[PDB]
């Protein structure tokens, strides 16, 4: 249901986009006012489509698992493109079924594999609304040599933005330029599963983490999160990966 047009995109229209994406995700409940996602849903209920439209009015449809906001694959015209991983093979039973051509991407949805495939670490891939527009275009035509980079842009501008207010704001503020994401942004992406897990545990442990989560802040300092008074809990994280989303 959720759509975003890059043409005329503002910091505001991008925020409306990311609040709608968040809103389209079922939750178990909230913890500390942070929505806690469902661990599991039936296949028929597990996937949603996000539509993104570049300056040229070319549209890609992106399939995400609503239990974890992982991107499973995308569709551009008659062609579907799914990550080479079991989660996406499963999604491909439910989504993009009338795609005439079905491609399996030569990588899993995992930043290490995507970075290897792009020959590029995230810290050197620009982000911003114009970056998102080139990603869409790159993916609409499936440059197999530029696609992995453009999947990292796409991932961070949807999935990651959805998960962290800091990521959202930082991307959406680049309306007519691009930026290189800080180690802070990267840290938050890397640490989502563990932070989420720790906040869950804290909920039956008086707000204490059982295990420190080490983040990098915007001054590049290593900082240790051990409780629910951390700024990352009260003023950043916007979605909790359920601890039971995997065995």
């Amino acid at each position: 249901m959720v759509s975003f047009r890059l043409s005329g995109a503002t910091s505001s229209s991008y925020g409306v986009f990311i609040s709608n994406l968040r809103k389209a995700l079922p939750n178990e409940r909230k913890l500390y006012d942070i929505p806690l996602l469902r661990s599991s849903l039936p296949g028929s209920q597990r996937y949603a489509l996000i539509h993104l439209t570049n300056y040229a009015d070319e549209t890609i449809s992106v399939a995400i698992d609503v239990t974890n906001v992982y991107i499973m694959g995308y569709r551009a015209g008659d062609t579907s493109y799914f990550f080479n991983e079991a989660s996406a093979t499963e999604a491909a039973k439910y989504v993009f079924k009338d795609a005439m051509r079905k491609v399996t991407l030569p990588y899993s949805g995992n930043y290490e594999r995507l970075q290897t495939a792009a020959g590029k670490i995230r810290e050197n891939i620009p982000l911003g609304l114009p970056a998102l527009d080139s990603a869409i275009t790159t993916l609409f035509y499936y440059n197999a040599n530029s696609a992995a980079s453009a999947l990292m842009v796409l991932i961070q501008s949807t999935s990651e933005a959805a998960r962290y207010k800091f990521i959202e704001q930082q991307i959406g503020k680049r309306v007519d330029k691009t930026f290189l994401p800080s180690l802070a942004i990267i840290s938050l992406e890397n640490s989502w599963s563990a932070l989420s897990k720790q906040i869950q545990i804290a909920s039956t442990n008086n707000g204490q983490f059982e295990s420190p989560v080490v983040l990098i802040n915007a001054q590049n300092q290593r900082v240790t999160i051990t409780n629910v008074d951390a700024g990352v809990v009260t003023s950043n994280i916007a979605l909790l990966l359920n601890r039971n989303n995997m065995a």
């Binding site: 207010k165 800091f166 800080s182 983040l215 802040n217 001054q219 999160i225 951390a230 700024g231 003023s235």
Partner: peptide, 10 residues
């Protein structure tokens, strides 16, 4: 709001 992310981490 900045790029300094003050209070959004620890």
């Amino acid at each position: 709001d900045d790029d300094m992310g003050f209070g959004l981490f620890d």
